[PDB]
């Protein structure tokens with residue numbers, strides 16, 4: 418399995434659908450290595466729940482929480498953490514407004530080596546319970562023998578790229594992790610890192626982050642050959658007054674680069690209503706009426722969440738993925754799993770007459786390029802060489818009576834899976 422791409426466990430589906438799936442408890446288990454220290458990057462944390470996901474033997478090892486919380490949100494987290502002496506926090510500078518520290522990553526230092534985990538889940542019970550989430554597991558990275566001269570770098574430059582990503586934080590506690598990464602051999606890594614980081618980027622530096630980073634890698638490491646672009650996410654930024662403002666102009670241009678139909682997958686009200694969670698799934702799909710009413714055009718691009726292939730049609734997506742399927746959807750030019758939702762905050766928007774890229778948030782993903790495995794394309798595994806696409810293809814268009822799930826309006830005409838209505842307020 419060259420991919421090491423996994424879905425999280427879902428409670429309440431048949432166990433066949435969890436066979437190759439992982440819970441955070443599985444990731445942290447002693448079978449994955451003898452833990453010595455860890456760093457947990459995320460957006461939302463429930464510290465009590467998190468500490469309990471580590472196996473008893475490891476609960477007392479150091480843990481760094483890397484977050485973006487400010488003011489009283491910050492104080493709350495520090496309070497959550499104060500009972501646990503082994504836990505330190507690192508507050509990611511968020512100098513631009515409306516930015517979040519959205520990256521989900523684990524750094525796991527063991528006696529045996531190092532593991533990097535990049536995934537889509539908040540560290541709260543509900544993100545790992547009945548949601549479709551994604552995980553990329555790095556190999557066990559051995560320590561570089563105290564005797565030798567080697568980079569430990571991979572053909573995809575993952576090691577240098579990850580260090581650069583960490584370096585942009587400008588944080589003392591991450592320097593220790595940067596130094597741990599220097600000491601390890603990451604050369605067997607076959608994926609590319611795509612990060613986002615808050616800032617205004619110029620000239621050559623445009624290529625370092627966001628959708629431009631993606632454009633750059635597809636230019637240099639893909640080749641050409643009406644292949645659609647698919648984008649799948651759980652939150653939706655304000656995209657402008659029509660598709661030419663950003664979506665179809667700069668965003669699609671990056672995505673169609675190599676060496677066209679745009680499908681966007683986002684849960685409809687009906688998808689949310691009949692899900693395993695019911696309407697409360699919508700708490701993790703924060704599309705607001707204020708944003709939505711300003712961009713009604715976008716919704717003709719929207720397609721339902723359907724995942725019969727992985728038995729997860731009823732497990733609402735909090736995973737985000739982007740890919741480039743062939744016209745019959747039987748193969749793909751590339752696959753990206755990432756924390757980045759469909760927003761400019763996350764992906765970057767062009768400023769000052771196209772000379773500056775503005776990104777508001779921290780995002781991180783991994784890109785699977787067939788060239789990294791010596792191939793031209795991946796075949797799609799039709800039932801979750803062949804890439805495990807976790808949802809159904811081709812994507813199904815919204816019906817005429819379907820609406821995008823919008824979190825802050827009431828749904829009181831029909832009860833959900835648990836016989837509840839939804840009245841936010």
Ligand SMILES: NC[C@@H](O)c1ccc(O)cc1
Nearest residue numbers: 460461539700701702703
């Ligand atoms: N329900 C928590 C709310 O803050 C939220 C909503 C969506 C996310 O992706 C993360 C957090």
